[PDB]
Design an enzyme around this catalytic site. Structure first.
Site, short mmCIF file in Angstrom:
data_model
loop_
_atom_site.label_atom_id
_atom_site.label_comp_id
_atom_site.label_asym_id
_atom_site.label_seq_id
_atom_site.Cartn_x
_atom_site.Cartn_y
_atom_site.Cartn_z
N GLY A 12 0.84 -1.18 0.00
CA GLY A 12 0.00 0.00 0.00
C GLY A 12 0.87 1.23 0.00
CE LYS A 43 1.17 4.24 7.86
NZ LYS A 43 -0.02 4.07 8.74
CG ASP A 85 -9.36 9.20 5.72
OD1 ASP A 85 -8.29 8.62 5.24
OD2 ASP A 85 -10.21 9.77 4.97
N1 3B3 Z 1 -5.18 2.51 5.31
C1 3B3 Z 1 -4.36 1.46 4.72
C2 3B3 Z 1 -4.58 1.05 3.20
O1 3B3 Z 1 -5.45 -0.08 3.48
C3 3B3 Z 1 -3.21 0.54 2.51
N2 3B3 Z 1 -3.42 -0.66 1.59
C4 3B3 Z 1 -3.27 -1.95 1.95
C5 3B3 Z 1 -3.64 -2.92 1.01
C6 3B3 Z 1 -3.48 -4.25 1.40
C7 3B3 Z 1 -2.96 -4.54 2.69
N3 3B3 Z 1 -2.85 -5.77 3.13
O2 3B3 Z 1 -2.56 -6.15 4.63
O3 3B3 Z 1 -3.20 -6.65 2.02
C8 3B3 Z 1 -2.62 -3.62 3.60
C9 3B3 Z 1 -2.13 -4.11 4.87
C10 3B3 Z 1 -1.79 -3.12 5.78
C11 3B3 Z 1 -1.94 -1.73 5.38
N4 3B3 Z 1 -2.40 -1.32 4.14
C12 3B3 Z 1 -2.75 -2.27 3.21
#
Ligand code: 3B3
EC number: 2.7.11.1
Length: 264
Positions: free
Chosen positions: A11, A33, A122
């Site tokens: 992400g 992150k 958000d």
């Molecule tokens: N606000 C965060 C937004 O969701 C960022 N996009 C994401 C897509 C897929 C996964 N993931 O665990 O497949 C994430 C997992 C953790 C954080 N982000 C993810």
């Protein structure tokens, strides 16, 4: 590259990126992150601070943090299901029963935050992640703030969030209550789940679709796709005066919210 290996990117936001990390010993997956304090140190000390207060089945788990230079690494529940955003077929949505289950779990998670004095600020499909059994978890407390502390509520003043999900009062008022702003964003999510489109770019008097909704022209084109029970709930949530807007404990008594739809 830190006890664990960084296997794939997940992400790629503004701050930095979320990568999926696996431990080579135990095989165990997490999300990391990565924020490079060089490319804010202030909102990130608040993000980790808020994260550590969090513990709930519908909120993404916080495991911990190291600082390794400028580089903060927040270690977070990996959600193998991805975003709710990808479950919504454009222009169509999803089966009503799946939306209802996701809306229940969204409500549980919001009730919990609010209960501990925290507003996410958000909520949108992109910030609702799905685990291995498709259970919804609210994600990313980067814009989260405290609105009740020692049992006194403070009004919010800073505008933030994402325009199509934002409540009118944040565009219009100098100070507003946190809770109703999150409830509204929950309604736009429901709308998105049940129709596969967003009602309006923003809830301003200067925006046609929004004007149309206040005039209850529901023959038009998000709302027509919806159905009279979930629509009824949406009439209660997307009410412009934040004071007359339904609250969560009252969402829980709503007829559609309590309508049986879904097998185990
Ligand atoms: N606000 C965060 C937004 O969701 C960022 N996009 C994401 C897509 C897929 C996964 N993931 O665990 O497949 C994430 C997992 C953790 C954080 N982000 C993810």
């Amino acid at each position: 590259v830190e006890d664990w290996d960084l296997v794939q990117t997940l992400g790629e936001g503004a701050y930095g990126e979320v990568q999926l990390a696996v431990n080579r010993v135990t095989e165990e997956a997490v999300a990391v992150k990565i924020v490079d304090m060089k490319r804010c140190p202030e909102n990130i000390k608040k993000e980790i601070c808020i994260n550590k207060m969090l513990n709930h089945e519908n909120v993404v788990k916080f495991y911990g943090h190291r600082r390794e230079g400028n580089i903060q690494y927040l270690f977070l529940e990996y959600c193998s299901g991805g975003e709710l955003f990808d479950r919504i077929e454009p222009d169509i949505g999803m089966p009503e029963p799946d939306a209802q289950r996701f809306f229940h779990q969204l409500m549980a998670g919001v009730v919990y935050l609010h209960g501990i004095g925290i507003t996410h600020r958000d909520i949108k499909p992109e910030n609702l992640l799905l685990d291995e059994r498709d259970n919804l978890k609210i994600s990313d407390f980067g814009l989260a703030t405290v609105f009740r502390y020692n049992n006194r509520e403070r009004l919010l003043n800073k505008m933030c969030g994402t325009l199509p999900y934002v409540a009118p009062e944040l565009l219009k008022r100098r100070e507003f209550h946190a809770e109703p702003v999150d409830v509204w964003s929950c309604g736009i999510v429901l709308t998105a789940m049940l129709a596969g489109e967003l009602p309006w770019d923003q809830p301003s008097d200067s925006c046609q679709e929004y004007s149309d909704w206040k005039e209850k022209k529901t023959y038009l084109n998000p709302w027509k796709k919806i159905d009279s029970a979930p629509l009824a709930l949406l009439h209660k949530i997307l009410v412009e005066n934040p004071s007359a807007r339904i609250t969560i404990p009252d969402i829980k008594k709503d007829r559609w919210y309590n309508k049986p739809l879904k097998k185990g």
